Amino acid sequence: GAMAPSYRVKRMDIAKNDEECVVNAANPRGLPGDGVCKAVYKKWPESFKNSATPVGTAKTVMCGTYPVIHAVGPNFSNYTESEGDRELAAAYREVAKEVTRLGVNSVAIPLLSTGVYSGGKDRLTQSLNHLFTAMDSTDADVVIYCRDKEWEKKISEAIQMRT
Ligand SMILES: Nc1nc2ccccc2s1
Ligand SMILES: [Cl-]
Ligand SMILES: [Cl-]
Ligand SMILES: [Cl-]
Numbered sequence: 361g362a363m364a365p366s367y368r369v370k371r372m373d374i375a376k377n378d379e380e381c382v383v384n385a386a387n388p389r390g391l392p393g394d395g396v397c398k399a400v401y402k403k404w405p406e407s408f409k410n411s412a413t414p415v416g417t418a419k420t421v422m423c424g425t426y427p428v429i430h431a432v433g434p435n436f437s438n439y440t441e442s443e444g445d446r447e448l449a450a451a452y453r454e455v456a457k458e459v460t461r462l463g464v465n466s467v468a469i470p471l472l473s474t475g476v477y478s479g480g481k482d483r484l485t486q487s488l489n490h491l492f493t494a495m496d497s498t499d500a501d502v503v504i505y506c507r508d509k510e511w512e513k514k515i516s517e518a519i520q521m522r523t
Contacts, residue, residue: 361500362465362499362501365498365499366502367495367504367519368501368502368503368504368519369504369505369512369516369519370503370505371507371511371512372505373399373505375399375402379464379466379467379503380427380465380466380467380500381420381426381427381428381459381466381467382400382404382426382428382469383467383469383470384396384400384407384411385397385433385472385473386400386411386413388412388413388414388415388432389412390411390430394476395475396470396475396505400428404423405423406421406422407422407423407428407430411430413430413432415433415434415447416432416446416447416450417432417454418430418431418432420462427462427464429455429459429462431452431454431472433447433448433451433477433487434447434473434477435477435479436477436478436483437477444473445486448483448487448490449490449493449494452493452495453493453494455494456497459495459498460498464500466500466502467500467501468503471504471506471515472487472490484511484514484515488518
């Protein structure tokens with residue numbers, strides 16, 4: 361584990377992370393996709409061998425020795441708010457199991473279901489709180505990645521609030 365497990369936020373391309381593994385915001389079919397998933401496919405294309413997995417699950421595939429954790433958040437266009445919320449919480453619980461099994465000291469993680477799967481709603485708080493519920497009992501350094509300058513400030517504020 362990390363000597364003093366922390367949460368941090370960075371506003372940059374997750375394909376440039378400085379962590380021991382990466383979480384992909386994957387689709388269920390292991391397709392190249394858009395956004396985070398596209399960047400992950402360009403950086404670690406070998407990790408898409410048999411990466412398909414159901415909604416609310418995570419499947420790890422190694423790119424050399426670098427672990428890519430394919431986490432499938434719900435598309436809120438298709439799920440009810442209630443069922444979507446349950447699957448989004450579950451995807452993060454599966455990421456915490458994988459991070460623990462791999463024995464990494466750090467992980468790069470995006471906010472699941474906040475982009476093209478958001479059903480056009482702002483889900484920063486909902487997604488980040490499910491990330492915390494899952495990751496709080498792990499001892500990896502967690503580095504949350506975002507693109508938007510206002511999201512960076514709100515994520516930073518939420519981390520600092522609980523410290
Ligand atoms: N290349 C990309 N990295 C990230 C990280 C966080 C959010 C969106 C994107 S798109
Ligand atoms: Cl960047
Ligand atoms: Cl998304
Ligand atoms: Cl963002």
